[PDB]
Amino acid sequence: MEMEKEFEQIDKSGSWAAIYQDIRHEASDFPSRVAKLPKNKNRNRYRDVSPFDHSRIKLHQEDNDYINASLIKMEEAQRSYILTQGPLPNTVGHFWEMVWEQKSRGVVMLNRVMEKGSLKCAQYWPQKEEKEMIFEDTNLKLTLISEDIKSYYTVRQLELENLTTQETREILHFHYTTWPDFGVPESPASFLNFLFKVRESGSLSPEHGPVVVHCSAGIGRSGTFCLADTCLLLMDKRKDPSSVDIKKVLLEMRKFRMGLIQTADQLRFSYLAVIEGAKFIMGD
Template sequence: MSDYTGDHYRPILMSSMNEQNFSGYINAVFINSNCQDDAFVVTQLPLKKTLSDFWSLVWDYKCTLVVLMHDPQDVSELNAQFWPEKGVIRHGGFSIKKISKATMAGYRETTLCIKHTDESQQTSLEVKLWQLKIWPKNETVPQSPSVFIGLIGMMEKHQQQQESDCHVLVTCCDGASRSGLFCAGAIVCDQIRSEGCLDVSQAVRSLKKRRIQLIPNKDQYTFCYTLAQSYLDSFETYGNFKH
């Protein structure tokens, strides 16, 4: 995969610095939300050789929520599962334990407990992993704007309960083709709710400043407007919104 990331916006790995051949590099990028700098971390699904780096990213930047933009079946076909279906797995200096799994409307939630195996660190990190189930692998956009909006709303509630330095990690097969739409959707919904206006072009430009390959086609750009209309339709009145 090509590296889409400018150095200025790339997270630097820190917790694995004692490992052999450690470089601190990972192909990931910070993305601003509508109201918070670097709220999201966008990265590709980990390769076998980068599993330790992926969990280092989760640990170092307190990514208490991981949003996986592929259906569980597609992840299986990609051979990209990076968490245990049961018990505990270890990658580099991290142990990952599955706590629970639940099927929600449009997504699957798995709760994980991450620990650093360094004896000097006694803390753990609880991570919610959400797998989207409404985006077929051969489609350019999800099937349901309303479910997508619901997921964004759940993400916002989750973040309100976290410490201010926590991040949301969004991942897809190449770190670009799907992840940007989730970030754009979150920005658009927050624009409408907090500012009473909508500027999809500004939202998309802000993403592309960080990683040009985000929102890679017209279908996703158009979906942002579809999502915005669906979000507005969820309110009983439009009186508080500017048109």
């Protein structure tokens, strides 16, 4: 069923809450035993959001290999993503260790450091060229190279140095700064423009490790980003684009991380973004 007609059907009948609860009921449940070990309690932002054991990213250290991060591997679309929580005061060094070890080119941030008067993640990158950051627990140095501030997003060029080997790499930071404190955006136009800027940079392409994407919990806004990207790519690849079923793609992604898409409003917004984005994919 053409999702656009499915969309109007759900909208006229006002059944978004019912659709979303069906997804929650059918979603996978896999163990997350490592996330729940007592030694890891200060590595998790939220008690109820954990990576599954089978898909979690492992840090390359014998001490404690745990980080709240999951590998979403989309086999038909030939795309992979790492979805993670906003870094905590005690995990900023782990976060950059993961970016280094997984050979990522880009980091996608969908939240502000402070929202609703409260801290939603650590200030984990440097704000001035001449004031670099050193992460002593993981032996990394991070320097701000340049910053481009636009009306709906900011793009930063960063230099990450492995102090053990003195190798350096360029990391691109894509920061969507205008998601509202409550609800979802009224129009998907600026979110789609942002997605296309990330694509154009190479950060989503197979010559690099997976993009790292996060918000505060790494499931809601972050889930919207990867769901929209994968659905638009599948519409490009298939003979019949109307065969792409967004609910089925979402359930596939929930095999790899729990809770993706947190509200019925986020589900509706994801539909809107794919419907409007397809009016470029099919040619427009």
